[PDB]
């Protein structure tokens, strides 16, 4: 949080990259460092490498990598995922007659549909467009 | 893509215009789903995407309603939509698993470690030149441009003198401007979240930073302006590395009538011009589906050599000879000539870039090698047996040719008619079928009109050199 | 036993005990490794003119040599026998008693006066009608040099004077560890 | 409720007033995410984009999703509808049907040409009868090894249809000639024919099997594509 | 320790359950929250 | 094998009598004698 | 494969979040009709 893109690359992306150099069937690595504070490293593997073995190996290296990171980064957490780029489908939820509001539709998709669909067999990941309800407290700095 | 510092409202306006255009193409388009603020490159306010379902194939049967016609029509939204960087209608790759879009995928590397400014300089030269190549269309960066940024510089000495804790200023500004999730609450049996953030009017402009105060240790309130200045800068929002080296990503498409290999060749020609222009020490790699294309093309020679070797060795084992295998493998050029000739002529008189040297062509070539070997073996094994029984070499060979002409020709015609349906196919993956069929059927024709003549002559020559 | 599976299982169990550990221990970092393959070679980087100390060399091996070598065709792992620099605050007791200061006071001022400030964005997502610009606001706050640490403010004197860190301590760049001294052929060295 | 949040107590003034949260902030129920705006045909909408887990059959997964969704539909609020905006499985199903139609057409054409050369119905039926056996046996065998029904294995089958009838054509043609040459009974004639043509049958089979063998030993994505054609064709030739 | 069953459900069971997506081969999940303070979540997988 | 070691013995009573909390004493010794890691700074683009 | 032998393991779900009281009431209506009508012996709810 709070770091420039250069700081991210120098202090996070590069050290994690160096740790990953030496996975079994690695084909190429692609990484990016963003100025909001985020880092992304995508590891591609050779054909015939088992996805589950690759994931466990990546975690095994990440374990020791994560001590070399800035303590704030450590506090944020690091995630490991396996996923493909292409979407199989996109489902659109809408009100044909305009008698259910957009906030409601968005919330309904997030509370009752997203979790059961992301647990069907074969589905690997679900990307949702439109958020759920939240309690929003907007502050007035003059009154503070 | 929209220019730097572009808001969600402007991105959505571009999408409104863009949406109508597709909506008005009524003989071709069924529905469009659009999202503003999201793209494959990343998530930002100046990016957006559209999912466009065309009408059913049964209805889009005229030339006007083909996918490529719509792609060309939409490629003018770049000229009409003026607030965008680009609006790019793209197609899925044949194998949507292996990529995200069709085209080439190029990584420009900074091998010599010259810097982000120099790397960008090279990329802009590349895009400028590629704009002028008639073989390419839609060449673009696949990454965020360098953007103005607001830089705050906090005066530590002043803050310390004023009683202000830099951690305290972090906390206040972070929550006010960025927002913060505190804890959960329950709504209809589900746990949701509670957020605290400043109201919108207080966090739009740098002048609103002068409305926020930080409590010092004495407890008094000192404005943010007392220990922070602010400045406009220029910087990169998103740095990238490919194979442990700083890089940028360039993608494009071949112009109509041009193959994927030709697009890659044009791109590599363009990249070679860089040193002559003064920019030295930049490398490139092909990534993604382009990397797969290059690797598949690289190994066809080894596939051909190996298949020919195994045919040679099995034929030596089966007839306890060396001359018979050489005679057989000597007529393989004549089978292969039809396959290549018919493929090329079909490409030229159909204008199709799909009819090309690809994976389907490769399997067709191996099949044609097999057919040629089969025909040869039919004539020569009978010729050899006739010679063992006791018969002049020429008498045996001419007799065998006469006797086997009918089965050879009917088997070759059976094979050739088997694959003709592939060549004449239409719709739903007909490109692959066309590659296989054109290659195999051409091979069948040359094998029938050229091969049968050459089998006996090569046999008699080889057997006259190596008698008995 | 599959060594990768054994390693993941062990560290997975380790998640369950991390919260019970002391904070000081937690911050340093708990690492898990498996045995695996052995050493092919050891390279020694040294100063043959006694011009560079072991610490700078170590720091130099870690920040400059490490990552280029990791990318070599057949390398599995690269490891350095040593670490990099640290900022070192060495306190004086009598000086602290002069100004009536404690080590905890200095620690509090260090953690208070050295931070990263996160801010947000201009024209952030739920923006106002007619918003024209969206930009990222970054605030550079962390210290970088010994002079900045020397100039940290602690308190004021009774007679309106200013007392900084440099008045009770000796600020220095030094080693993250002081427990080992390594030499190659008799002179400063760091091992890879 | 928002009213409860409005009442959170914050502090007290020197005068004595009690500062609440409503006194400093606006509280309302909104989103947890403000960074996307999704529409469908120009109208506001919500979208779910699904990606398959690696190793799953897309058609199977799409069927399961539609099943679960049809189950869920029964509790929609009044006024909620859904629709697939972006979907790939139509093309897949269509292209499978394409390959199957061309395979049937291949069979018909091969039968016609074999009839053109073998002028009788009896002679003609024998190589035709080979096709079902070899096709179905090849499917059985390759399924034993985990190969599916995809566009590539179907292309291989279509390519094989014209090779698998070969050994049969050779056999039947030799019988017909022998029967014509010396007028003898079908049984005697056949015994004589096989003794003549067994070596040719073996040679044909050996070359056609050998050409497609090395293909199965390449790696990468290209090797995966190759193995389909390779294994299918090899099984077809041995079975023939 | 010390929590009522409702507290366990709101502050632990749903929080842990909302990450149990994307698991290959999952059939169903059964969870309970008891008034002695324990949360149990059982994840069941397809054969193989 | 075991080696001589030095033990600090602090009369809680005197400290109470002298107005010093046992916690203050502990922290002073901890920082003074043991050392302590406070936070990080970025020297030349690397975290130390 | 289960804590104790039994058949027809049914689960009644509170879709659209009615509440615990509502779920218990719905279950009770079900259990009342189950005993009274046909082809059912020993229909009981499991937990506390
Ligand atoms: C008798 C030999 C018959 C040769 C059959 C023709 C094979 C062929 O396609 O030749 C071209 C091939 C390279 O093909 P290309 O796609 O241009 O890859 C670059 O060139 C080759 O791979 C040469 C293979 C020669 C193998 C000799 C057998 C040992
Ligand atoms: C053009 C053809 C010239 C080569 C040739 O025809 O070889 C014929 C010769 C005699 O063959 P044969 O009479 O059957 O014993 O064959 C020979 O006498 C020598 C041929 C030996 C070939 C060895 C090849 C092994 C290749 C696998 C490696
Ligand atoms: C050098 N070479 C010729 C030896 C050799 O020839 C043979 C062999 N061929 O067998 C050996 O065994 C060696 O490889 C070996 O065993 C060693 C290590 O492990 C090791 C170590 O682990 C830590 N531990 C630390 O924590 C240090 N950290 C730095 C930052 C904070 C602390 C400190 C340390 F000095 C060492 C020394 C090496 C020696 C090495």
Write out the DSSP string of A87-114: -SEEEEEE-TTS-S-HHHHHHHIIIIIH
CA distance D204 to A37: 67
CA distance C1 to C5: 8
CA distance E31 to D64: 24
Are C118 and A2 a contacting pair, CB within 8 Å? yes
Ligand nearest to the CA of C86: 3
CA distance A67 to C18: 13
Do F45 and A71 lie within an 8 Å CB cutoff? no
CA distance D171 to D202: 12
User: Ligand 1 centroid to B264 CA: how many Å?
Assistant: 23
Q: In a mutational test of the pocket of ligand 3, which residue from C35, C36, C81 has the highest number of ligand atoms less than 8 Å from its CB?
A: C81
Are B118 and B281 a contacting pair, CB within 8 Å? no
- The residue whose two tokens read 């013995």 is F9
Do A130 and D38 lie within an 8 Å CB cutoff? yes
Does A91 contact B at CB distance below 8 Å? no
Domain region containing C94: 87-175
Are A60 and A94 a contacting pair, CB within 8 Å? no
Phi, psi of B149 (to 5 degrees): -135, 155
Q: Which residues form ligand 1's pocket by a CB distance below 6 Å?
A: B 300-301, 304-305, 308-309, 329, 332-333, 336, 357, 365
Q: Which residues form ligand 3's pocket by a CB distance below 6 Å?
A: C 39, 42, 81-83, 177, 180, 191
Count CB atoms within 10 A of the CB of residue C181: 8
DSSP C77: -
CA distance B206 to C121: 10
Are D162 and D109 a contacting pair, CB within 8 Å? no
User: Ligand 2 centroid to E34 CA: how many Å?
Assistant: 85
CA distance D157 to D150: 11
CA distance B39 to B48: 5
Burial of G22 (0-12, 13-18, 19+ CB in 10 A): exposed
CA distance E24 to C137: 41
- Reported residue count of chain E is 48
Residue B306 with chain D: CB contacts under 8 Å: 214
- Order across the sheet with A89-94: list the strands: A123-129, D46-52, A89-94, D81-87
CA distance A32 to A12: 11
Sign of the CA dihedral C151, C156, C161, C163? negative
Count CB atoms within 10 A of the CB of residue D16: 6
- What is the β-pairing status of strands C135-140 and B147-153? parallel
- What is the β-pairing status of strands B231-235 and B238-242? unpaired
Do C4 and A53 lie within an 8 Å CB cutoff? yes
- Order across the sheet with B231-235: list the strands: B231-235, B147-153, C135-140, C117-122
Sign of the CA dihedral C52, C57, C60, C66? positive
Per the structure block, which two tokens stand in for A56? 């466990």
Give the residues across from B79 on adjacent strands: none
Give the residues across from B106 on adjacent strands: B250, B286
CA distance B138 to B79: 13
Per the structure block, which two tokens stand in for A49? 């490498």
Could you identify the atom of ligand 1 that is nearest to the CA of residue B357? 16
Residue A56 with chain C: CB contacts under 8 Å: 4-5, 8
- Give the Å distances, CA to CA, from F44 to A143, F15, F41: 42, 46, 10
Put simply, the chain C residues between 68 and 107 with a CB less than 8 A from any chain A CB are: 70-71, 75-77
Crossing angle (nearest 10°) for helices D186-211 and D220-239: 170
Could you identify the atom of ligand 1 that is nearest to the CA of residue B300? 18
User: Ligand 1 centroid to B302 CA: how many Å?
Assistant: 8
CB of residue B315 inside a 6 A radius of ligand 2: no
- Where do the H-state alpha helices sit in chain D? 2-6, 58-72, 89-117, 121-144, 151-164, 166-181, 186-211, 220-239
Element (H, E) at B157: helix B156-162
Per the structure block, which two tokens stand in for D119? 């002028």
User: Ligand 3 centroid to F47 CA: how many Å?
Assistant: 24
- Give the Å distances, CA to CA, from C9 to A68, A74, C33: 22, 21, 12
Q: Looking at CA atoms only, how far is residue E9 from chain A in angstroms? A: 17
Closest residue of chain D to A115, computed from CA coordinates:
D48
- Give the Å distances, CA to CA, from B143 to A53, B275, D67, D85: 31, 24, 39, 27
Do A96 and D221 lie within an 8 Å CB cutoff? no
- Where do the H-state alpha helices sit in C99-176? 103-113, 146-150
* Spatial CA neighbour of A61 closest among C45, D26, C34, B158: C34
Label residue C22 left, alpha or beta by phi (over 0 means left) and psi (-120 to 50 means alpha).
beta
Does E10 contact B at CB distance below 8 Å? yes
CA distance C73 to A133: 52
* Spatial CA neighbour of A108 closest among D185, B10, D78: D78
Breaks (C-N over 2.5 A) in chain B follow: none
* Spatial CA neighbour of B328 closest among B439, B465, B451: B451
* Spatial CA neighbour of A20 closest among A10, A29, A11, A9: A29
Of the partner residues E21, E25, E46, the one whose CB lies closest to the CB of residue A115:
E21
* Spatial CA neighbour of B434 closest among B321, B347, B307, B327: B347
């Amino acid at each position: 949080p709070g770091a420039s893109a250069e700081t991210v690359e120098n202090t996070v992306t590069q050290i994690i990259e160096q740790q990953m150099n030496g996975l079994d069937g690695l084909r190429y690595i692609s990484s990016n460092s963003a100025g909001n504070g985020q880092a992304s490293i995508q590891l591609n593997f050779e054909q015939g490498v088992d996805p589950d073995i690759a994931q466990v190996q990546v975690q095994n290296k990440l374990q020791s990598a994560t001590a070399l990171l800035p303590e704030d980064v450590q506090r944020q957490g690091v995630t490991v995922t396996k996923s493909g780029a292409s979407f199989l489908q996109v489902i659109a939820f809408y009100s044909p007659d305009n008698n259910l509001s957009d906030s409601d539709i968005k919330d309904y998709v997030n509370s009752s549909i997203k979790e059961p669909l992301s647990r069907v067999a074969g589905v690997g990941e679900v990307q949702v467009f439109g958020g759920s309800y939240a309690m929003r407290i907007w502050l007035d700095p003059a009154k503070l | 893509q929209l220019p730097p510092n572009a808001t969600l409202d402007r991105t959505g306006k571009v999408i409104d215009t863009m949406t109508n255009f597709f909506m008005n193409e009524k003989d071709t388009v069924e529905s469009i789903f659009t999202v503003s603020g999201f793209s494959f490159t990343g998530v930002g306010q100046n990016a957006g995407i559209g999912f466009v379902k065309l009408k059913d194939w049964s209805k889009r049967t005229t030339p006007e309603t083909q996918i490529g016609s719509l792609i060309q029509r939409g490629m003018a939204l770049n000229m009409i939509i003026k607030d965008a960087s680009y609006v790019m209608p793209l197609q899925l790759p044949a194998m949507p698993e292996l990529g995200v879009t069709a085209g080439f995928n190029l990584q420009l590397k900074d091998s010599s470690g010259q810097g982000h400014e120099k790397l960008i300089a090279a990329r802009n030269t590349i895009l400028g030149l590629a704009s002028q190549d008639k073989r390419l269309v839609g060449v673009r960066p696949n990454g965020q441009e360098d953007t103005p940024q607001y830089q705050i510089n906090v005066d530590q000495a002043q803050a310390g003198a004023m009683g202000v804790s830099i951690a305290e200023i972090n906390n206040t500004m972070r929550i006010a401007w960025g927002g913060s999730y505190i804890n959960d609450f329950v709504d209809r049996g589900r746990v949701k979240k509670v957020y605290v953030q400043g109201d919108a009017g207080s966090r739009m402009m740098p002048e609103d930073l002068n409305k926020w105060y930080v409590r010092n240790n004495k407890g008094e309130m000192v404005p943010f302006s007392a220990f922070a200045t602010g400045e406009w800068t220029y910087g990169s929002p998103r740095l990238e590395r490919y194979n442990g080296v700083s890089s940028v990503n360039i993608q494009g498409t071949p112009a109509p009538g041009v193959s994927s290999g030709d697009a890659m060749k044009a791109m590599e020609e363009i990249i070679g011009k860089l040193p002559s222009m003064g920019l030295q020490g930049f490398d490139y790699e092909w990534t993604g589906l382009s990397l797969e294309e290059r690797e598949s093309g690289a190994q066809a020679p080894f596939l051909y050599a190996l298949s020919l070797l195994i045919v040679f060795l099995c034929l030596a084992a089966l007839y306890e000879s060396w001359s018979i295998p050489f005679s057989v493998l000597l007529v393989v050029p004549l089978g292969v000539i039809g396959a290549i000739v018919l493929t090329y002529l079909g490409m030229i008189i159909k204008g199709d870039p799909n009819l090309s040297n690809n994976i389907y062509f490769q399997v067709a070539i191996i099949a044609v090698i097999g057919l040629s070997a089969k025909n040869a073996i039919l004539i020569v094994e009978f010729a050899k047996e006739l010679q063992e029984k006791g018969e002049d070499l020429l008498d045996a060979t001419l007799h065998a040719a006469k006797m086997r002409l009918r089965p050879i020709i009917m088997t070759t015609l059976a094979f050739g008619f088997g694959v003709l349906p592939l060549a004449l196919s239409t719709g739903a993956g007909a490109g692959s079928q066309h590659s296989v069929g054109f290659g195999v059927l051409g091979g069948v024709l040359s094998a029938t009109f050229l091969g049968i003549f050459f089998i006996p002559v090569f046999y008699v020559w080889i057997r006259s050199i190596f008698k008995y | 036993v599959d060594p990768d599976i054994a390693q993941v299982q062990v560290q997975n169990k380790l998640q369950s005990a991390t919260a019970l550990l002391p904070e000081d221990v937690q911050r340093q970092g708990v690492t898990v490794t498996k045995s695996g393959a052995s050493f092919l070679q050891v390279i020694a980087f040294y100063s043959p003119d006694n011009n560079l100390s072991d610490s700078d060399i170590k720091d130099y091996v870690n920040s400059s040599i490490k990552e280029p070598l990791s990318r070599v065709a057949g390398v599995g792992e690269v490891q350095v026998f040593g670490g990099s620099y640290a900022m070192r605050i060495w306190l004086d007791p009598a000086k602290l008693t002069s100004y009536q200061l404690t080590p905890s006071d200095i620690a509090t001022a260090l953690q208070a006066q050295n931070s990263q400030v996160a801010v947000g964005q201009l024209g952030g997502a739920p923006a106002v009608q007619g918003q024209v610009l969206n930009a990222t606001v970054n605030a550079q706050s962390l210290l970088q040099t010994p002079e900045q640490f020397k100039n940290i403010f602690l308190k004021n004197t009774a007679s309106g004077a200013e007392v900084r860190l440099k008045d009770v301590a000796r600020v220095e760049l030094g080693s993250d560890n002081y427990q080992f001294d390594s030499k190659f052929n008799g002179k400063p060295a760091a091992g890879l | 409720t928002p009213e409860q949040f409005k009442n959170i107590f914050l502090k007290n003034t020197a005068s004595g007033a009690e500062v609440r949260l409503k006194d400093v902030a606006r509280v309302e129920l909104g989103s947890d995410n403000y960074q996307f705006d999704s529409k469908f045909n120009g109208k506001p909408a919500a979208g779910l984009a699904i990606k398959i887990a690696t190793g799953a059959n897309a058609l199977d997964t799409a069927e399961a999703v539609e099943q679960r969704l049809s189950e869920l539909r029964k509790n929609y609020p009044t006024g909620l509808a859904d629709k697939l905006a972006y979907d790939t499985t139509p093309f897949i199903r269509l292209s499978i049907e394409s390959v199957v139609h061309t395979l049937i057409e291949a069979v018909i054409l091969v039968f016609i040409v074999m009839f053109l050369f073998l002028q009788n119905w009896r002679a003609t039926i024998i190589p035709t009868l080979a096709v079902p056996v070899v096709v179905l046996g090849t499917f059985a065998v390759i399924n034993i090894f985990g190969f599916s029904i995809n566009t590539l294995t179907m292309f291989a089958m279509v390519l094989a249809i014209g090779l698998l009838v070969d050994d049969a054509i050779v056999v039947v043609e030799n019988v017909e000639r022998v029967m014509s040459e010396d007028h003898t009974d079908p049984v005697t004639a056949t015994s004589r024919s096989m003794q003549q043509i067994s070596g040719a049958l073996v040679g044909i089979t050996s070359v056609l099997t050998a050409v497609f063998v090395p293909m199965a030993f390449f790696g990468g994505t290209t090797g995966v594509i190759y193995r389909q054609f390779s294994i299918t064709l090899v099984t077809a030739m041995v079975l023939s």
